[PDB]
Design a protein around this nucleic acid. Sequence first.
RNA 1: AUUGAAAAAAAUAAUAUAUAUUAUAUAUAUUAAUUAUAAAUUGAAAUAUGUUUAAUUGAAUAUAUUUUAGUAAUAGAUAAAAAUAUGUACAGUAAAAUUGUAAGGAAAACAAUAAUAACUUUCUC
Lengths: 234, 113, 93, 274, 348
Amino acid sequence: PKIKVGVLLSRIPIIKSELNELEKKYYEYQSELEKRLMWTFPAYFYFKKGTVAEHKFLSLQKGPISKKNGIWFPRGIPDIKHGRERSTKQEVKLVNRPVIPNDRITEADRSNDMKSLERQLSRTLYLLVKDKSGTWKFPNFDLSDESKPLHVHAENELKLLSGDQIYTWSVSATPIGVLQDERNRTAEFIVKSHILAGKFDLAFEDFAWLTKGEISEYVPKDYFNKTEFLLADN
Amino acid sequence: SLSPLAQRVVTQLSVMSASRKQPKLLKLAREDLIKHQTIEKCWSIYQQQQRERRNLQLELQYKSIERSMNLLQELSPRLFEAANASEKGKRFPMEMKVPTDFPPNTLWHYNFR
Amino acid sequence: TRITLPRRPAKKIQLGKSRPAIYHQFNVKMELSDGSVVIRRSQYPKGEIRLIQDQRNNPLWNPSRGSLDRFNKRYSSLFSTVELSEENKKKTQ
Amino acid sequence: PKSACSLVKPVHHLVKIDKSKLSPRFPELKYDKSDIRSPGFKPKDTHADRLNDHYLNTLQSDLLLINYSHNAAVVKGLKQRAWSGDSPYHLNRPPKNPRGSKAQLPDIHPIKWSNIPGLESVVINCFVREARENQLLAITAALQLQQITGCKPHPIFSKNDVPTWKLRKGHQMGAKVELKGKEMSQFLSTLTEIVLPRIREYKGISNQSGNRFGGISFGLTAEDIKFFPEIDANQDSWPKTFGMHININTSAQLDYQARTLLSGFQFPFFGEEK
Amino acid sequence: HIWSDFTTRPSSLSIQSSKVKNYLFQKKASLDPPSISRRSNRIKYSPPEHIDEIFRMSYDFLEQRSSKFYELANKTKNPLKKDALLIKAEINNPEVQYNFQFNNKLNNVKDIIDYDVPVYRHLGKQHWESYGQMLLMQRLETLAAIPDTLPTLVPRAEVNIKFPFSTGVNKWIEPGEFLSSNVTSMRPIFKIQEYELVNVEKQLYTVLIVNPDVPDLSNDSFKTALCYGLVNINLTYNDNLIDPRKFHSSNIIADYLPPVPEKNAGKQRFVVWVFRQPLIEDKQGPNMLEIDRKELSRDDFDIRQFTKKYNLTAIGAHIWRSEWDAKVAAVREKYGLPPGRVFSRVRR
RNA sequence: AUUGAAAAAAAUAAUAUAUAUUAUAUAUAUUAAUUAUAAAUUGAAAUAUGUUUAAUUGAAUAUAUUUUAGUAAUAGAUAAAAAUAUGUACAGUAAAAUUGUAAGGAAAACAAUAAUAACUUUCUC
């Protein structure tokens, strides 16, 4: 049987994963529970008495309503220590420049450019390739020599395809899996490797960088079943 | 009584201490308590499911690797030997960074070295 | 001789009544050397910090991507290679 | 006391009697600390841990792939050897201690989907030696630790006595703090990003550093602690500052695996490996 | 939405209180908790923020899970497995949790906590294991009621006794209590609460109160005494209080003789044992059993031998213990028992 | 109970009140507190009563009445640093040696160092 070299290039996510609707709400609740149970902010430590910095902090803050004799407090009598209502959550409001974070969605994402690497930042992108036929697949390469190791050969092939734009890193010498068949007596040993910093851009007609959910749409069903578990969900 | 250094130490100690800084106990109604329990239990179940999914995936990957390596051993001994080496001092590349909360100004570097 | 803070009588935390130390913490945004922002919980009161020297501008963490400085500043008009070639006769040593 | 003879009587049933539950003494203590009704309640899973998420997604699969050795069997550790029964004096004799070591060593298992190496715990041991003179220095060190971590420190006391170093027994000297879960992860992330780049000439954690089994360590000077953002934000509040040891405990079978794992979280490693 | 449906599912799984149910299921945290009865206290109270939407999501998640379980549950044929599936489906239901936790389990009202329902029965079992069962086991071991009467116990049914007819006061007896001779003058009332899946129609039970500590001066030791013996009793998960109402005179193999401890004879353990009958196949209806009433004796009673004879399995137990007081003579006189012996204060 | 928001009730336990019994039970009502305790010409906050600004509320400021700040460690049934050495109840396991780690070095501190077959529960193929 012919030995062939499968390669799937894994661009790892550059930001946090997006939270599930269930997850977000739960986290908010836990944060609010924490706040309710949180201690008083010891302002006396962080801000020295009779100082310009303290004064601004005081102005930003608003104090708690104290207990006073001859008055009904229908939400119980105020329990105060270090200037906080013990019965409730405390809120503490706070080059010289405002830290403005960048948008997590990108220009590429908006346009839906599949060849770009900046198109999904919270997901793991995988390099797919379209051959002479209409099928998509992970980059295949013929291993005729069999002198060098397999992963190294794969990397060299990728580099050749690129024209030395790509900068990859093999995770290991061990192959993740095999794609095998009876019609063509061959064996495609799949290597894993990580794109670190470069273009691809280019026999194969077209390519794309896709998440696990999009690969199912592009690639055949049997092929997907064979190589589903290899891909990360996020 | 005390020096300024002693005072500052006491203040520092206070920052860490629970003395007169902590609120009342979080009391709930019985209905509220139940609601909380149902929230927590469901969450725990979800977390377990996620763990199983990930664990299952890992097991599947391991099985695939095993299947591959047996095949490699059968076909080309040299290739199998090359694959199965001690990767003792293997280091993850310093470019594969831990994904931040929000992305940088330059999202991706196209040139290198 | 030994400098100390002499202890008062300790307050009896009853069994079951012990409460966990939940310190007051703010959600603080750290903008690193480049524009990548990251949220971290912090005890000091500052909603936003921007950092100058981080892993994201250190050469050790990204290989692929002040006496000397003072000297450069105050010998700038002269512009100080050609200068090396001029002042490097290797006969005397 | 009529006697000191301790002797637990056998029972006539297999039901496991939890004696704590039969009392009415500590009603708040019968609840688990996870339960909302306990005064010991704390919101655990407050926000999504970032380093942990990264490990789950990218690293864990990669680590598994690295650690696969084909048909790798278990390597048994050094254990207590039994005596050959070639003499009647071997008959109730305690077993021979292990070959090289006095203590027994664990078995090294092959890495599979279950036992992939991962972060277990961080411990930040700060023993300030000037606090043999000044107890207040121990307090300041503990505060610093708390600031750095967002976790409650525990006081270290002088366990030993020695004349050469002016050290008594039973004297409060610095503090420690075992970080676990999300706080630990945050602390690691801060170390990777903020602090360890601001050390000027740092090559890395040594490759000769570590336990024999999945534990790696290093230490920060008093100069290095001034880069932590809680410290960093105010120079003025901290005139003095104390170094610290940082014991990272992994779920790794061996130390090279642990080193590889830490590298995955952006820890540089410089020295010649064992 | 399986948990809102009550076509096939019992009524007990819902909360019977309307206000409580409304509070549980609302779209905003507007209403105030029915548990807090007082207006001022309600005003004072503040529930934790964001709790509603998350709760709703959790409900949906667990409701979906329950529905999925039910898909399996109906396909299942064998009964224990089906019951287990049913339990799995409904155990995380908030309404059933509310019902169980905050209403009485001992004298359960059928509409609130139905022990015919498998989930509620499972909950009750779990509750029993948490405290009451452990306590019972401790009292059996410490007092030495197990090896002295009947080798071991594997507690399955929760057994609670009462003495309503003697005095007037209502009190479930805590295991290993010292009761007065006035209290235990007339017979007790049992409640055998069964938590295992069992054939309610076929399964009969026997109840034996035994006194291991009556002194035999010929042997210079003690002998057993069957103080009260019932057989062929029918239990039902909800209808389980063994009272003169239920059992007939035919069921009484040995009618209640009261504790009458002798002076200085010591403390006398009275340990009730509850056995279930052996169930015979290929026979519809409850399989009775005949006891040879001349063979079994009350003044000396091999409990273990009796059990061996009739092939019984001890599922439950309870114990009190009586010692001499002034009124035991009066009790004897009432029952027509003889004057009663008096022993030496010293155990020489 | 008055106040906010938009017929009732059905556990345990605690509290209040009542009574049942030579039975520390039952009935009804309600779910408090939970890390505090005197003493502060000086810090900080609230409320009330005035005055000025853009019937009004915000904002500023004066007096009065309060409230906070005395900033101090254990937060765990703690478990081989030191401290109450006799009772009882509940629970746990030491040491050495080895491999490491900022000053630390043979000798300060912290970490790690025997085996999971079977069993129960939970999630899952």
